Design an enzyme around this catalytic site. Structure first.
Site, PDB file in Angstrom:
ATOM      1  N   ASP A   1       0.974  -1.738  -0.084  1.00 24.17           N
ATOM      2  CA  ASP A   1       0.011   0.233   0.104  1.00 24.17           C
ATOM      3  C   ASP A   1       1.003   1.436   0.317  1.00 24.17           C
ATOM      4  O   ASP A   1       2.454   1.347   0.375  1.00 24.17           O
ATOM      5  CB  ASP A   1      -0.875  -0.250   1.474  1.00 24.17           C
ATOM      6  CG  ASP A   1      -2.202   0.287   1.717  1.00 24.17           C
ATOM      7  OD1 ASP A   1      -1.949   1.532   0.850  1.00 24.17           O
ATOM      8  OD2 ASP A   1      -2.838  -0.241   2.271  1.00 24.17           O
TER       9      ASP A   1
ATOM     10  N   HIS B   1      -0.744   3.524   1.874  1.00 27.68           N
ATOM     11  CA  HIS B   1      -0.734   4.171   3.012  1.00 27.68           C
ATOM     12  C   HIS B   1      -1.164   2.990   4.012  1.00 27.68           C
ATOM     13  O   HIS B   1      -0.749   1.291   3.986  1.00 27.68           O
ATOM     14  CB  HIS B   1      -2.477   3.868   3.291  1.00 27.68           C
ATOM     15  CG  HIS B   1      -2.162   5.179   1.820  1.00 27.68           C
ATOM     16  ND1 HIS B   1      -3.144   4.708   0.758  1.00 27.68           N
ATOM     17  CD2 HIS B   1      -2.130   6.439   1.505  1.00 27.68           C
ATOM     18  CE1 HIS B   1      -3.290   5.454  -0.340  1.00 27.68           C
ATOM     19  NE2 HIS B   1      -2.819   5.934   0.085  1.00 27.68           N
TER      20      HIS B   1
ATOM     21  N   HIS C   1     -11.566   2.358   5.630  1.00 28.34           N
ATOM     22  CA  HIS C   1     -10.942   1.218   4.978  1.00 28.34           C
ATOM     23  C   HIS C   1      -9.180   2.204   4.731  1.00 28.34           C
ATOM     24  O   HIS C   1      -7.889   1.753   4.776  1.00 28.34           O
ATOM     25  CB  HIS C   1     -10.937   1.965   3.360  1.00 28.34           C
ATOM     26  CG  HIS C   1     -10.611   3.793   2.385  1.00 28.34           C
ATOM     27  ND1 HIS C   1     -10.205   3.784   1.111  1.00 28.34           N
ATOM     28  CD2 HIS C   1     -10.768   4.431   2.749  1.00 28.34           C
ATOM     29  CE1 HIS C   1     -10.551   4.622   0.851  1.00 28.34           C
ATOM     30  NE2 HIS C   1     -10.588   5.889   1.821  1.00 28.34           N
TER      31      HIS C   1
ATOM     32  N   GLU D   1      -9.280  -1.992  -3.404  1.00 28.48           N
ATOM     33  CA  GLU D   1      -9.363  -0.723  -4.322  1.00 28.48           C
ATOM     34  C   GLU D   1      -9.146  -1.044  -5.932  1.00 28.48           C
ATOM     35  O   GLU D   1      -8.918   0.512  -5.872  1.00 28.48           O
ATOM     36  CB  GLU D   1      -8.859   0.320  -3.498  1.00 28.48           C
ATOM     37  CG  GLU D   1      -8.118   0.559  -1.613  1.00 28.48           C
ATOM     38  CD  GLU D   1      -9.777   1.228  -1.333  1.00 28.48           C
ATOM     39  OE1 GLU D   1     -10.667   1.467  -1.887  1.00 28.48           O
ATOM     40  OE2 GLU D   1      -9.753   0.787  -0.160  1.00 28.48           O
TER      41      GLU D   1
HETATM   42  C1  LIG Z   1      -3.643  12.347  -1.268  1.00 31.56           C
HETATM   43  C2  LIG Z   1      -4.942  12.082  -0.188  1.00 31.56           C
HETATM   44  C3  LIG Z   1      -6.050  13.984  -0.135  1.00 31.56           C
HETATM   45  C4  LIG Z   1      -5.977  10.896   0.700  1.00 31.56           C
HETATM   46  N1  LIG Z   1      -7.029  11.667   1.410  1.00 31.56           N
HETATM   47  C5  LIG Z   1      -4.992  10.180   1.464  1.00 31.56           C
HETATM   48  O1  LIG Z   1      -4.488   9.129   0.571  1.00 31.56           O
HETATM   49  N2  LIG Z   1      -5.066   9.756   2.068  1.00 31.56           N
HETATM   50  C6  LIG Z   1      -5.038   8.488   2.649  1.00 31.56           C
HETATM   51  C7  LIG Z   1      -4.204   8.050   4.555  1.00 31.56           C
HETATM   52  N3  LIG Z   1      -4.392   8.740   5.172  1.00 31.56           N
HETATM   53  C8  LIG Z   1      -6.307   8.536   4.497  1.00 31.56           C
HETATM   54  C9  LIG Z   1      -7.209   8.078   6.003  1.00 31.56           C
HETATM   55  O2  LIG Z   1      -6.958   7.482   6.751  1.00 31.56           O
HETATM   56  O3  LIG Z   1      -8.881   8.752   5.340  1.00 31.56           O
HETATM   57  C10 LIG Z   1      -6.151   8.366   3.121  1.00 31.56           C
HETATM   58  C11 LIG Z   1      -6.422   5.979   3.676  1.00 31.56           C
HETATM   59  C12 LIG Z   1      -6.399   5.388   2.745  1.00 31.56           C
HETATM   60  C13 LIG Z   1      -6.862   4.128   2.538  1.00 31.56           C
HETATM   61  B1  LIG Z   1      -6.729   3.256   1.601  1.00 31.56           B
HETATM   62  O4  LIG Z   1      -7.180   1.209   2.158  1.00 31.56           O
HETATM   63  O5  LIG Z   1      -6.624   3.191   0.222  1.00 31.56           O
HETATM   64  O6  LIG Z   1      -4.884   2.670   1.792  1.00 31.56           O
HETATM   65 MN   LIG Z   2      -4.987   0.651   1.886  1.00 34.92          MN
HETATM   66 MN   LIG Z   3      -3.762   2.849  -0.019  1.00 37.23          MN
END
Ligand SMILES: CC(C)[C@H](N)C(=O)N[C@H]1CN[C@H](C(=O)O)[C@@H]1CCC[B-](O)(O)O
Ligand SMILES: [Mn+2]
Ligand SMILES: [Mn+2]
Ligand SMILES: CC(C)[C@H](N)C(=O)N[C@H]1CN[C@H](C(=O)O)[C@@H]1CCC[B-](O)(O)O
Ligand SMILES: CC(C)[C@H](N)C(=O)N[C@H]1CN[C@H](C(=O)O)[C@@H]1CCC[B-](O)(O)O
Ligand SMILES: [Mn+2]
Ligand SMILES: [Mn+2]
Ligand SMILES: [Mn+2]
Ligand SMILES: [Mn+2]
Lengths: 317, 317, 317
Positions: free
Chosen positions: A122, A124, A139, A275
């Protein structure tokens, strides 16, 4: 072979984030011919179907956390099906859907195999708590629901009373991080979680990245591996049809090298392909480029190698 | 200067594959100013012109093998021409044309230098025998007819009675592999051929790959180098106008690295720049982009260094 | 912190090259909110404004060298401003504007810190003398004016009498080279200048490149670092809106990695973000991509990290 014995589980779930479309992910992943491509790959494939996620009305938020009962119910449902698939002696293959479903996928898998180690691919960390989150999108919170060290840092959120953290901060390695929130960075360093952010991948190369990941997690004893793969781990030039894209990502080659080295252990027990949002591609081509990359990533997990493959016969005879 | 003395051979041949246009490769590479660019680079160049491959009507298939007499005779004439350029003390430069012409190029080069070693830059192994092949396309079979270890596995194909295998399995190195047939993978593995697929390049970096390739071929004794460069070896984001493209290929830099490093050996003796197809571009820019990458790979083969180059003169006076 | 204490200098100057629009580099970097993003990164930021460059009438060329008085006065002006910033304990951050301004940037910095070490990230060496040049553009000549070893090889050029060479040929490391003129390559060889061209980058990987860069400059003891960053050092796929683009450049990832590594030393004392030309993008997105890349490069120099950042507070309480 056991490394090729699979059990497909669809998860048409989107309520863990605000962008509509990620729920169509398994349908679009099936239209690409995933079962078929794996069948030709010497894999014993069984479709356990697409989970029935019932619409939960009046799902009021928990503070800033959105659709709690819906996200908790979906992961609870997935936890039972993943658990069933594992008792059936098959590698669980979850087709997401948003990365919140990982609460269920890992928990279900941990019921049958509790000694499992996680590889989270990821951009993230997804380690926000219902208290550290700024967005309230679940998520980006699944890792905090699963860590034992984060017991008492997670409150009684509606729909998640079934949850019982099944992994320790030591049983998880991150790969591809480039978009970590301050709360998440504080959690990452204080718990001393092992990670390879893009900086580490640039320093060492994906070869040493994999060498250390597999050594840290599988050194002492051989143990089941759960790979949770967010398509946003790879650069948007390969997977643009995704909810949260981040530039300077893992290349197509790096993604294939990660999934090749994991097959080569023969210890993969669980898989998440998350995703993939087909409603988010700028052109219909950007959509198929995401789906094809997702298909290519999955095939490499179950034996498809770039050097080539053959059946145990004499081709020269 | 030996490493900068060149004999150009245009090999406008297309009947080794099903798509028209590849025979225009010598035309578009010349129009790009390759000759002039090589002379600006302190090279001594001679152009032997384009080989006329008189029509071979009455060229029915040998089993599934398409145009065997045409493929056979074009290579045979190329073999005579390459050997001729080699006698004249020049490094042979074959501008293709499809990769079946490599049977002629390597046979002709080996007739003069039997101790040559092969570096094969391609996404494909091109080692199908007329019996393991499913396509019947001879551009995916050159290595089978050339390998000494495969004698007794190549049947009597019309047009190829002149072929005598000249390269032992130990005297070839593959770089860039990512699309290998089951029959080809079995050959590759059983004969123990040295290869660096896209998996190995990812694992070690192009730095170690080239250090290993040049030590593997020249470790025991310094011998002439035959480089057979298929443009599909590089990623289609750099060489799109090609008949058999495969994603996750060699980068522009990596390609210039391989050629710059082969140049430094001072041992380059034969060069093939194959599979440029100017009618396979989706846009006119894709065509120019292909030809330009092809010409940039070629110029690195004959001395062009990214760090710069200077004449033995005092530039400050 | 000392490494997050900045003096912003805007240099809206383009007469070191012929292409109009590079003078709007300070405008566009400011509009993208660089200053607001730095303060959010825990930076102490003071704005010294955009330098006014008086238009010089009758600026007769010296031989082939265009506008020597304009280029000479603009560097003289910047040298004053940088010294002033350095004296008030801040890291001078110059927003260009063409690369000729590095004469004044480095000279100014060396007036306060004469023990400085230079990292020059660029596709080019910019070490041409007013006599070795064939273009007559001063943006391709600043290193020749700064080097001590070239005193006697630089004649009396109008606008540059105030210049005193302040660095030794051993006090500089080049990263990204792939387009070097013969005379520049000659100087590079005869003065034994340390460089990592794209060839060394491909051979060693950006990790080993950064190990050797800091080890070479800081080995004996800690000394201040000046980073001269030309956006064309990166590939035109990431920074297209620039005057002299070259294919096969440093990736977005390698750029971030160099800067992250320099920040980690806590020794950055001088920075130049050069050659962004917002009038050279084919589409408006090419302009934003360049600017966003330049913004991200500057953020990494002052602490922004891909693994994440956080304030020194407890996020779990
Ligand atoms: C680039 C910015 C604007 C964006 N809000 C972005 O990527 N942010 C990430 C990092 N933390 C955010 C949260 O806690 O809501 C977002 C989570 C992403 C969840 B994943 O499963 O898709 O990994
Ligand atoms: Mn993720
Ligand atoms: Mn992600
Ligand atoms: C990817 C699949 C569909 C495609 N037929 C493809 O590339 N396949 C390769 C692999 N073996 C095939 C054959 O025997 O015809 C093809 C030969 C390519 C020859 B070359 O000289 O261009 O390297
Ligand atoms: C590619 C060729 C044709 C082109 N003239 C090019 O880039 N060349 C470089 C190399 N020497 C030239 C000069 O002296 O004018 C150019 C300097 C570039 C300065 B810089 O600050 O942008 O790094
Ligand atoms: Mn080929
Ligand atoms: Mn090929
Ligand atoms: Mn430059
Ligand atoms: Mn420059």
């Amino acid at each position: 072979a056991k490394s090729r014995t699979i059990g497909i589980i669809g998860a048409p779930f989107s309520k863990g984030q605000p962008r509509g479309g990620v729920e169509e992910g398994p349908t679009v992943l099936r239209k690409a011919g995933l079962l078929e491509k794996l069948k030709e790959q010497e894999c014993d494939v069984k479709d356990y179907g697409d989970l029935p996620f019932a619409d939960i009305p009046n799902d009021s938020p928990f503070q800033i956390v959105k659709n709690p009962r819906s996200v908790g119910k979906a992961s609870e449902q997935l936890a039972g099906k993943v658990a069933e698939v594992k008792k059936n002696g098959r590698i669980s293959l979850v087709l997401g859907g948003d990365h919140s479903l990982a609460i269920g996928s890992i928990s279900g898998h941990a019921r049958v195999h509790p000694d499992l180690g996680v590889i989270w691919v990821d951009a993230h960390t997804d380690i926000n708590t219902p208290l550290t989150t700024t967005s309230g999108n679940l998520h980006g919170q699944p890792v905090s629901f699963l860590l034992k060290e984060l017991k008492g840092k997670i409150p009684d959120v509606p729909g998640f009373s079934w949850v019982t953290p099944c992994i320790s901060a030591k049983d998880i390695v991150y790969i591809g991080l480039r978009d970590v929130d301050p709360g998440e960075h504080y959690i990452l360093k204080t718990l001393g979680i092992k990670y390879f952010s893009m900086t580490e991948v640039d320093r060492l190369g994906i070869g040493k990245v994999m060498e250390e990941t597999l050594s840290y997690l599988l050194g002492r004893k051989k143990r089941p591996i759960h790979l949770s793969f967010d398509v946003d781990g790879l650069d948007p030039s390969f997977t643009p049809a995704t909810g949260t894209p981040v530039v300077g990502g893992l290349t197509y080659r790096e993604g294939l090298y990660i999934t090749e080295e994991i097959y080569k252990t023969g210890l993969l027990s669980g898989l998440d392909i998350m995703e993939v949002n087909p409603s988010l591609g700028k052109t219909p081509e950007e959509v198929t480029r995401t789906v094809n990359t997702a298909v290519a990533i999955t095939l490499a997990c179950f034996g498809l190698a770039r050097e080539g493959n053959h059946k145990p016969i004499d081709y020269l005879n």
